[PDB]
Design a protein around this ligand. Structure first.
Ligand code: 5AE
Length: 194
């Protein structure tokens, strides 16, 4: 029903955070941009890297915020506000503790689950949580005390590859996602196995 006009990939900026688990969303958008031949331009006005492509006669934008994760909403609100994009036309890709590496799922709305990127977006969008999420499994360390070090760590080879695989799976349902056919996207996606 509602075409996606903005795809956001969450991550922390800088060499220290590059390739860490918490940057799974940004990796997805990087991959997507490369596959679609889209340049990601550093644009201070949107506090991030912004790309654009055309699909079915509409501009679709790609955003990787270059705020810290906990201020990602500032970036999403700037770009969405400027182009008058409603939450229902936004997809946010992010790392998900509650699914293992190799699993990707889609979800509309819900809470943030302790993810400070998602939390700031919900807050900045005038407390609207009804955007869509691409949830990219990164596994869970096994206790709450270990979570912060875990998401800011670099995963071993095996887990990284599994993430790459889930990103591949998600890119396979891009047509459905872009069209806003979440029902069909979920059917195709939630039946894949790494
Ligand atoms: N439950 C939970 N707790 C924390 N975090 C992230 O860990 C990072 C480093 O502390 C923070 O930026 C949270 O987004 C998270 O993603 N989920």
């Amino acid at each position: 029903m509602t075409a996606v006009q903005l795809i956001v990939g969450l991550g922390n900026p800088g060499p220290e955070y590059d390739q860490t688990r918490h940057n799974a969303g940004a990796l997805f958008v990087e991959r997507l941009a490369h596959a679609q031949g889209v340049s990601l331009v550093a644009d201070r006005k949107y506090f991030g890297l912004v790309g654009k492509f055309s699909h079915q006669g509409k501009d679709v934008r790609l955003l990787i915020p270059t705020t810290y994760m906990n201020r990602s909403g500032q970036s999403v609100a700037a770009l969405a506000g400027f182009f008058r994009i409603a939450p229902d036309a936004i997809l946010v890709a992010h790392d998900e503790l509650d699914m293992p590496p190799g699993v990707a799922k889609l979800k509309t709305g819900g809470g943030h689950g302790g993810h400070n990127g998602l939390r700031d977006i919900i807050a900045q969008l005038g407390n609207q949580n009804s955007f869509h999420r691409l949830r990219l499994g990164i596994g869970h360390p096994g206790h709450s005390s270990l979570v912060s070090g875990y998401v800011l760590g670099r995963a071993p080879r095996s887990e990284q590859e599994l993430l790459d695989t889930s990103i591949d799976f998600a890119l396979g349902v891009l047509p459905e996602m872009l069209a806003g056919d979440w029902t069909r996207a979920m059917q195709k996606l939630h039946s894949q196995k790494a």
